Amino acid sequence: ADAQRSHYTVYPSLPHIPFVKLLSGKESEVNVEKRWELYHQLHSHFH
Amino acid sequence: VIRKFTKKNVARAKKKYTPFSKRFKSIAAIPDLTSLPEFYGNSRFENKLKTTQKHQIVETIFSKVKKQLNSSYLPARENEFASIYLSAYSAIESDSATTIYVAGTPGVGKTLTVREVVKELLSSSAQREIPDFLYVEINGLKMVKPTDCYETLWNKVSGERLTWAASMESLEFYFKRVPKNKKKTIVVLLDELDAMVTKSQDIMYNFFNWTTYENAKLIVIAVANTMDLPERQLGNKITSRIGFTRIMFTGYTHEELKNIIDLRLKGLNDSFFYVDTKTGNAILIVRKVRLRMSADAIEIASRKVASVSGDARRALKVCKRAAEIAEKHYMAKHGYGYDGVQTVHITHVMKALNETLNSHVITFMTRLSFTAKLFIYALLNLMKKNGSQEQELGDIVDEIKLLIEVNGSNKFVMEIAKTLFQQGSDNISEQLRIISWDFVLNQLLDAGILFKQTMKNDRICCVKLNISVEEAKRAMNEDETLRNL
Amino acid sequence: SIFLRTKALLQKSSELVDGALPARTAEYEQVMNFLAKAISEHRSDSLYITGPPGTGKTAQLDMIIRQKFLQNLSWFELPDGRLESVAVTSINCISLGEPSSIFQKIFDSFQDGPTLQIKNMQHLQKFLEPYTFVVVLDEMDRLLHANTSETQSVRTILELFLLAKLPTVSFVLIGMANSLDMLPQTIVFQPYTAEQMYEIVIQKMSSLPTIIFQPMAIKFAAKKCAGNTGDLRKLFDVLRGSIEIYELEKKIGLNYIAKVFSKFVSTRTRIAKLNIQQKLILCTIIQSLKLNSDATIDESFDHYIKAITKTDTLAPLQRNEFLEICTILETCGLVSIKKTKCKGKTKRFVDKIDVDLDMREFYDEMTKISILKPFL
Ligand SMILES: Nc1ncnc2c1ncn2[C@@H]1O[C@H](COP(=O)(O)OP(=O)(O)OP(=O)(O)O)[C@@H](O)[C@H]1O
Ligand SMILES: Nc1ncnc2c1ncn2[C@@H]1O[C@H](COP(=O)(O)OP(=O)(O)OP(=O)(O)O)[C@@H](O)[C@H]1O
Numbered sequence: 001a002d003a004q005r006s007h008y009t010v011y012p013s014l015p016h017i018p019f020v021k022l023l024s025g026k027e028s029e030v031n032v033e034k035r036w037e038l039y040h041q042l043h044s045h046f047h
Numbered sequence: 048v049i050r051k052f053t054k055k056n057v058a059r060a061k062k063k064y065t066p067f068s069k070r071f072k073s074i075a076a077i078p079d080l081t082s083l084p085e086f087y088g089n090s091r092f093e094n095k096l097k098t099t100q101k102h103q104i105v106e107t108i109f110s111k112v113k114k115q116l117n118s119s120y121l122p123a124r125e126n127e128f129a130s131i132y133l134s135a136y137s138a139i140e141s142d143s144a145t146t147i148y149v150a151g152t153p154g155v156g157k158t159l160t161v162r163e164v165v166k167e168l169l170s171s172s173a174q175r176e177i178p179d180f181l182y183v184e185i186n187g188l189k190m191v192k193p194t195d196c197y198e199t200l201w202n203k204v205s206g207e208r209l210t211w212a213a214s215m216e217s218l219e220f221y222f223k224r225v226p227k228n229k230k231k232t233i234v235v236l237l238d239e240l241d242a243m244v245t246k247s248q249d250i251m252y253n254f255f256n257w258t259t260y261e262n263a264k265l266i267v268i269a270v271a272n273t274m275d276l277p278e279r280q281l282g283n284k285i286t287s288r289i290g291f292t293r294i295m296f297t298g299y300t301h302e303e304l305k306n307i308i309d310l311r312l313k314g315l316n317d318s319f320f321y322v323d324t325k326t327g328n329a330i331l332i333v334r335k336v337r338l339r340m341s342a343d344a345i346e347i348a349s350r351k352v353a354s355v356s357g358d359a360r361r362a363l364k365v366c367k368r369a370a371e372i373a374e375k376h377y378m379a380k381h382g383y384g385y386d387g388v389q390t391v392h393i394t395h396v397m398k399a400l401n402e403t404l405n406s407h408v409i410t411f412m413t414r415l416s417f418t419a420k421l422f423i424y425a426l427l428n429l430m431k432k433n434g435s436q437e438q439e440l441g442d443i444v445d446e447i448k449l450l451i452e453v454n455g456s457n458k459f460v461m462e463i464a465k466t467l468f469q470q471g472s473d474n475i476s477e478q479l480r481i482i483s484w485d486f487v488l489n490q491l492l493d494a495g496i497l498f499k500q501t502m503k504n505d506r507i508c509c510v511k512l513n514i515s516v517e518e519a520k521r522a523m524n525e526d527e528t529l530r531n532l
Numbered sequence: 533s534i535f536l537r538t539k540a541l542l543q544k545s546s547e548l549v550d551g552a553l554p555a556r557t558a559e560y561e562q563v564m565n566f567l568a569k570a571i572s573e574h575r576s577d578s579l580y581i582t583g584p585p586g587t588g589k590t591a592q593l594d595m596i597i598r599q600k601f602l603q604n605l606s607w608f609e610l611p612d613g614r615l616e617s618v619a620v621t622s623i624n625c626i627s628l629g630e631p632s633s634i635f636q637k638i639f640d641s642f643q644d645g646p647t648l649q650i651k652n653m654q655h656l657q658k659f660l661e662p663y664t665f666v667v668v669l670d671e672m673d674r675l676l677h678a679n680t681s682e683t684q685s686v687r688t689i690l691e692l693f694l695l696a697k698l699p700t701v702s703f704v705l706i707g708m709a710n711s712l713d714m715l716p717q718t719i720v721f722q723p724y725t726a727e728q729m730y731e732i733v734i735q736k737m738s739s740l741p742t743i744i745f746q747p748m749a750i751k752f753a754a755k756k757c758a759g760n761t762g763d764l765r766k767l768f769d770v771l772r773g774s775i776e777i778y779e780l781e782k783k784i785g786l787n788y789i790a791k792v793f794s795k796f797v798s799t800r801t802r803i804a805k806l807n808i809q810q811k812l813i814l815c816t817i818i819q820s821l822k823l824n825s826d827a828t829i830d831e832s833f834d835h836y837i838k839a840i841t842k843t844d845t846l847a848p849l850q851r852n853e854f855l856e857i858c859t860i861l862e863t864c865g866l867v868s869i870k871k872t873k874c875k876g877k878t879k880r881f882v883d884k885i886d887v888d889l890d891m892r893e894f895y896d897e898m899t900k901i902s903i904l905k906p907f908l
């Protein structure tokens with residue numbers, strides 16, 4: 001049992017932005033992508 | 048490259064790292080090690096300590112006696128000899144591996160008996176009643192490191208020089224895997240076994256676990272101080288492997304010590320010598336001088352030594368010291384330098400025996416100065432009043448001051464108070480310590496009379512007597528001044 | 533001769549003569565049940581063998597790998613019985629330098645080829661991962677770390693054990709350890725009793741033509757070598773000593789077993805061999821040790837002078853004469869002189885007197901003498 005050990009490395013299996021759809025799920029995906037790009041262009045401009 | 052420290056005195060031995068288990072292809076490929084040139088042992092420094100003598104040195108009558116009583120040059124060890132010889136002979140004859148445990152007090156003839164057993168076994172193997180064997184002797188106190196035993200024994204077996212871990216695996220492989228028809232019996236004496244005890248007991252377990260192996264053909268004679276050394280300092284595995292049948296070397300009785308000394312002095316006691324009166328040189332067969340050492344003196348020396356220790360070294364040294372005392376008196380009275388009846392008497396034996404019995408502690412404290420005696424006396428007063436067995440140094444300072452100022456009508460104190468507190472001088476102020484205060488403190492610490500605590504405050508540092516109180520009082524009762532007050 | 537052959541069989545190094553020990557059938561069957569369960573199902577598990585010294589754990593397991601069995605690959609017969617290839621090795625742990633190197637010792641026991649550095653169990657796990665393997669760790673009590681907190685001391689050993697409880701690894705651990713010196717399945721080897729030792733002795737010298745021992749002598753030796761911590765090595769040494777005593781004085785009976793047990797094994801006789809000066813010193817030593825119990829020779833001599841002056845029995849003697857009588861009682865066994873460090877404000881090494889004699893027999897011997905009764 002790896003839970004009974006000190007440190008163990010695992011490799012997850014695999015078979016893309018963290019922004020969610022607003023307006024109770026009625027907002028389009030293009031508005032989500034635009035909001036992502038606008039957040040990054042303000043964030044980079046500040047930093 | 049800039050080095051953070053340097054080790055510029057490294058002395059590394061030319062010892063290889065490959066063990067015996069990796070120099071042949073298999074177990075069945077190992078050749079017969081008995082028919083090998085380097086295996087089983089098949090002095091260059093003796094010339095360096097020789098010089099030319101250009102004086103005829105004068106050996107008196109007592110010189111042969113004193114050379115005779117040396118430990119370097121067995122009436123009482125016949126059952127221990129029989130037991131060790133029977134066990135070793137049975138293990139050599141049957142190709143068996145075994146342990147023989149021997150223990151005893153110093154000087155009771157353990158090493159001598161084991162070496163005589165080994166010499167008699169070699170004599171038996173010379174005329175072919177037992178198979179040939181190798182003899183290895185390992186003293187635990189003659190090793191720089193305890194693991195050097197691993198380096199020693201393998202070097203006596205194979206003739207190779209390896210490091211200690213590689214030697215240990217080589218010995219393990221040789222004892223476990225090499226067949227008995229391919230090897231030779233080895234008898235190893237482990238002398239001073241308590242010096243081979245480590246914190247993890249690796250060497251002890253390895254040496255007594257190789258004896259439990261079938262193919263080993265190893266006989267280990269382990270010589271120790273006490274019977275209960277495995278039961279005190281070793282684990283239950285090593286105590287189980289050593290065994291239960293353990294051989295006691297008890298101390299000698301006075302008859303045995305007397306027989307040992309008489310067997311030393313067998314040819315020269317009650318004998319005749321040709322002695323040149325001008326020089327004192329004695330020649331065994333100008334005056335014919337009859338030499339004797341009395342049996343009563345030897346007897347009581349044997350009785351005293353046997354009651355104390357049973358040590359043959361001590362009895363031989365007491366007799367040799369008596370002979371030295373007699374020779375010193377003889378050369379004093381005859382005017383003999385270094386280039387009808389001579390008797391080593393009983394008074395010389397009693398002078399030799401009492402010389403290690405007279406105590407110089409009271410004699411030393413009797414001949415100290417007045418200030419050291421005053422220190423000891425004030426310390427005894429503090430131990431009398433407060434009863435602590437450890438007194439502060441400031442308390443000793445104030446008690447010395449009080450003893451000076453109370454007995455200020457004593458004539459000696461009136462004559463010496465200016466010496467203790469001004470060194471007999473005007474222009475020297477009244478001092479807080481007496482003159483030679485730290486001198487007598489360090490003198491009593493050097494002699495081992497006192498113990499001083501490690502503190503940097505001089506007043507509350509404590510001082511304890513290391514000797515008994517009555518001999519200190521006795522020494523204080525000899526002095527005429529400290530008796531009066 | 534028959535005596536030399538009997539002593540050769542009675543050594544600790546003698547050859548063990550289907551493949552089970554005479555008095556160890558149940559443990560042998562349990563070990564084979566473990567091996568048949570782990571090898572056929574190809575499971576990862578861990579065995580742990582407990583016992584007192586000389587109970588036959590090493591002998592039975594060496595019998596198992598000798599009879600019933602990439603180097604160390606051996607063919608093994610199942611209870612079903614097709615075949616199996618299994619890498620079984622037996623690593624003694626005292627020959628290890630470091631306890632953390634055992635994985636490397638596990639690796640070098642199996643390979644020829646490549647040589648890769650193993651400093652943890654992970655390299656061992658990835659080495660054994662693409663493949664079963666049995667390691668027999670004898671004297672595994674060496675694998676505990678000294679001067680290390682409980683946790684870090686058990687540190688390596690559970691890494692030996694938890695890898696034995698991992699899926700998809702082909703690892704079987706059989707760890708034989710001594711109980712007296714110190715989850716996996718535990719097998720205990722109980723110390724032998726008298727009938728088991730009798731059966732072992734008769735079966736082990738069944739090779740010899742003529743039995744030189746009497747049977748009741750062997751039963752008496754087995755009964756005397758029994759109870760808690762029952763060692764078969766002790767029985768072998770007792771029989772070998774009986775043969776040695778017999779041929780030194782010249783069948784073997786009860787009297788020679790008693791001769792061994794009296795030869796190789798009391799404070800009433802020690803006191804009785806003393807004069808009145810030495811009995812006086814032994815009385816003042818014990819009286820001084822009631823008051824202090826950490827008292828030097830000078831403090832023991834300190835008490836003796838005060839006891840004389842209130843009694844005036846015998847002339848008072850010097851300090852070095854006192855230490856000589858203490859050396860005489862050291863030789864007699866009544867006194868045990870050690871040098872240890874005192875534990876006051878000033879710490880140095882001092883010599884102090886210890887007594888371990890029986891106090892019940894001390895008061896009986898001294899109350900008969902009237903002048904010594906003030907000194908109790
Ligand atoms: N039985 C004896 N007969 C004659 N001389 C003896 C006898 N026993 C001892 N000696 C003498 O005493 C010396 C010391 O003996 P030995 O070296 O054997 O002592 P030991 O018992 O091994 O002691 P230690 O523990 O100090 O090594 C010997 O060299 C020898 O001169
Ligand atoms: N049941 C038995 N039948 C025959 N011989 C035995 C038996 N048990 C032990 N022996 C023998 O007793 C001696 C000790 O055996 P072994 O080495 O197996 O003990 P052990 O339990 O490993 O002890 P330790 O913990 O001290 O190692 C050896 O000579 C061995 O051959």
Ligand SMILES: [Mg+2]
Pocket residue numbers: 157158238
């Ligand atoms: Mg010696």
Ligand SMILES: [Mg+2]
Pocket residue numbers: 589590591670
């Ligand atoms: Mg074992």
